[PDB]
Write an enzyme that holds these catalytic residues in place. Sequence first.
Site, PDB file in Angstrom:
ATOM      1  N   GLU A  17      -5.879 -11.193   8.137  1.00 35.74           N
ATOM      2  CA  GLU A  17      -6.632  -9.997   7.864  1.00 35.74           C
ATOM      3  C   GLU A  17      -7.981 -10.306   7.202  1.00 35.74           C
ATOM      4  O   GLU A  17      -8.605  -9.412   6.648  1.00 35.74           O
ATOM      5  CB  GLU A  17      -5.691  -9.042   7.111  1.00 35.74           C
ATOM      6  CG  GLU A  17      -5.615  -9.248   5.628  1.00 35.74           C
ATOM      7  CD  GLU A  17      -4.543  -8.406   4.936  1.00 35.74           C
ATOM      8  OE1 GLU A  17      -4.575  -7.074   4.869  1.00 35.74           O
ATOM      9  OE2 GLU A  17      -3.585  -9.155   4.482  1.00 35.74           O
ATOM     10  N   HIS A  38       0.812  -1.217   0.000  1.00 35.78           N
ATOM     11  CA  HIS A  38       0.000   0.000   0.000  1.00 35.78           C
ATOM     12  C   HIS A  38       0.848   1.270   0.000  1.00 35.78           C
ATOM     13  O   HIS A  38       0.808   2.096   0.924  1.00 35.78           O
ATOM     14  CB  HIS A  38      -0.995  -0.042   1.162  1.00 35.78           C
ATOM     15  CG  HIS A  38      -1.996  -1.158   1.056  1.00 35.78           C
ATOM     16  ND1 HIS A  38      -2.927  -1.169   0.026  1.00 35.78           N
ATOM     17  CD2 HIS A  38      -2.201  -2.298   1.784  1.00 35.78           C
ATOM     18  CE1 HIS A  38      -3.643  -2.294   0.108  1.00 35.78           C
ATOM     19  NE2 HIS A  38      -3.283  -2.962   1.202  1.00 35.78           N
ATOM     20  N   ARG A  65       6.923  -5.580   4.360  1.00 37.07           N
ATOM     21  CA  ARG A  65       5.593  -6.142   4.160  1.00 37.07           C
ATOM     22  C   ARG A  65       5.388  -6.228   2.649  1.00 37.07           C
ATOM     23  O   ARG A  65       5.318  -5.204   1.948  1.00 37.07           O
ATOM     24  CB  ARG A  65       4.540  -5.285   4.879  1.00 37.07           C
ATOM     25  CG  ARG A  65       3.177  -5.958   4.897  1.00 37.07           C
ATOM     26  CD  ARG A  65       2.299  -5.641   3.733  1.00 37.07           C
ATOM     27  NE  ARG A  65       1.702  -4.269   3.741  1.00 37.07           N
ATOM     28  CZ  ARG A  65       0.614  -3.922   4.399  1.00 37.07           C
ATOM     29  NH1 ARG A  65      -0.031  -4.844   5.106  1.00 37.07           N
ATOM     30  NH2 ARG A  65       0.121  -2.695   4.343  1.00 37.07           N
ATOM     31  N   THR A 101      -7.263  -3.061   9.991  1.00 38.87           N
ATOM     32  CA  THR A 101      -8.172  -2.344   9.104  1.00 38.87           C
ATOM     33  C   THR A 101      -8.831  -3.283   8.086  1.00 38.87           C
ATOM     34  O   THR A 101     -10.064  -3.228   7.947  1.00 38.87           O
ATOM     35  CB  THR A 101      -7.461  -1.104   8.548  1.00 38.87           C
ATOM     36  OG1 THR A 101      -6.427  -1.531   7.663  1.00 38.87           O
ATOM     37  CG2 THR A 101      -6.842  -0.278   9.654  1.00 38.87           C
ATOM     38  N   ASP A 102      -8.032  -4.168   7.443  1.00 40.14           N
ATOM     39  CA  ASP A 102      -8.538  -5.172   6.530  1.00 40.14           C
ATOM     40  C   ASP A 102      -9.464  -6.114   7.290  1.00 40.14           C
ATOM     41  O   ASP A 102     -10.507  -6.537   6.747  1.00 40.14           O
ATOM     42  CB  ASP A 102      -7.396  -5.877   5.760  1.00 40.14           C
ATOM     43  CG  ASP A 102      -6.958  -5.190   4.444  1.00 40.14           C
ATOM     44  OD1 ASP A 102      -7.872  -4.816   3.672  1.00 40.14           O
ATOM     45  OD2 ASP A 102      -5.659  -5.155   4.122  1.00 40.14           O
TER      46      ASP A 102
HETATM   47 MN   LIG Z   1      -4.172  -5.167   5.135  1.00 42.32          MN
HETATM   48 MN   LIG Z   2      -4.741  -6.331   3.201  1.00 39.29          MN
END
Ligand SMILES: [Mn+2]
Ligand SMILES: [Mn+2]
Lengths: 252, 251
Positions: free
Chosen positions: B145, B44, B69, B170-171
């Site tokens: 997640e 992200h 990540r 969050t996911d």
């Molecule tokens: Mn995530």
């Molecule tokens: Mn994710």
Amino acid sequence: HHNKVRTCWNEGRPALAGWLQLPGTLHAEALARLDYDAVVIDMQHSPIDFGQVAPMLIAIELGGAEPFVRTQVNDPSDIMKLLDAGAYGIIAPMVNTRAEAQTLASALHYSPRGLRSFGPRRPSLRYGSGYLAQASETVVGLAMIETREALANIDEILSVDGIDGVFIGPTDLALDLGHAPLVDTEEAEVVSAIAHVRERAHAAGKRVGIFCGSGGFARVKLAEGFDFVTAAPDLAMLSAAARQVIADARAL
Amino acid sequence: HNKVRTCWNEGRPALAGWLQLPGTLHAEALARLDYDAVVIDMQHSPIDFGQVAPMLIAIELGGAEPFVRTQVNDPSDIMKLLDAGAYGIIAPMVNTRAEAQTLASALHYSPRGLRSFGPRRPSLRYGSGYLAQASETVVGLAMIETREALANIDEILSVDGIDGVFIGPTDLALDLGHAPLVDTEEAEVVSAIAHVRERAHAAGKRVGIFCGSGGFARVKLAEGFDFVTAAPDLAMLSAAARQVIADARAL
Ligand SMILES: [Mn+2]
Ligand SMILES: [Mn+2]
Ligand SMILES: [Br-]
Ligand SMILES: [K+]
Ligand SMILES: [K+]
Ligand SMILES: [K+]
Ligand SMILES: [Mn+2]
């Protein structure tokens, strides 16, 4: 089709600008979308070269702030290439004499006002067909005052028509004047020097900006009547944020 | 040695930074703070392989352990990062035992795994004796997640070759049908997070979590999380700039 800093000025208000020393487009855009009128990219005290600055100029313009650059040196060809890549503000270091101020001015205007070379790749796209008519207006130019000699030659520097004004570097001035290079120095000789420059610039009908290490220092300078105030370097703000996050996380 | 594994070996958790902005200068600056690791987010963020490679060098020089990540749980991508001196891997969307085994595979040389041998940067750090200690030098966490991952937590935690799991809150909140807010108070999410932690501890595995604030992270540490991240560079920078502008404009 207007320079956002000039828009401030034309309404009798100051501009507030960000200050980038980290390369990259994501934070540039994000900060440009904040209540900044401009974002300065620092190409002197940073690792940002031309290849990295070029996309950053685009990001800033999309985020909706005027893209500025503090160059590494007052060199006309350097400044020309940045203007052609869509830098719409230029802060040039180490402008210590009238001749050096004239050197800055030469780069900002096409003949007959200066000697800027013609090839406006990105400004022609922003401003389109009517660019050349208004080209000088589209750019803001400021000469840095950061030495004892610049201080001595302030009136002859402000006499130069083709610059908008001067830009105070307080830390470089403190160091040149024999003092410590503190962030947001309030060393009395330096405070006096800065007060003097601001006066002479206003008296000469020129703009005066100043670099600020903090929100608090910028608020003072805005209250003092500075026209262009920067606050604060992205790297300093991020490091201090991370230090505070860590302190909060490791607290009892 | 791996600084995070040192923490764990000395009975203490690790606090880690979290980067979504490419570049080496802030990576080194944040690594020199009181972080044990700094995670580079390649999912992200606009950070590609070319950009991540010098950032791992910078983090190591600053004296934190460089973690990544990844964009995806893909063995060859992970192997190239290990070879480039990523000493920690957080793989997204590990939802099954099979997927956790795929992660494990990438982290260990035969016969324990199938990592390809060509350790450009680790051989510079560790010298000719690298192979005997290679597994130890790396930390591997599977991301939890989704509802699926939640259901399969024990089967995921069963896999040899991973150190534990890393919760993406969050996911997870989103997949449970709630708003993707960081550091959420939503009861169902808070309960799921506590559950994964409990399961991981009962299985003798480590558990991490992504945090948006130091205040939240302090709580997570107090609750026994092994590996706590706080907070993304872009988020912190953005909040800092907003406060500076408010202070300057006297808002
Ligand atoms: Mn995530
Ligand atoms: Mn994710
Ligand atoms: Br966040
Ligand atoms: K270059
Ligand atoms: K703006
Ligand atoms: K550190
Ligand atoms: Mn200087």
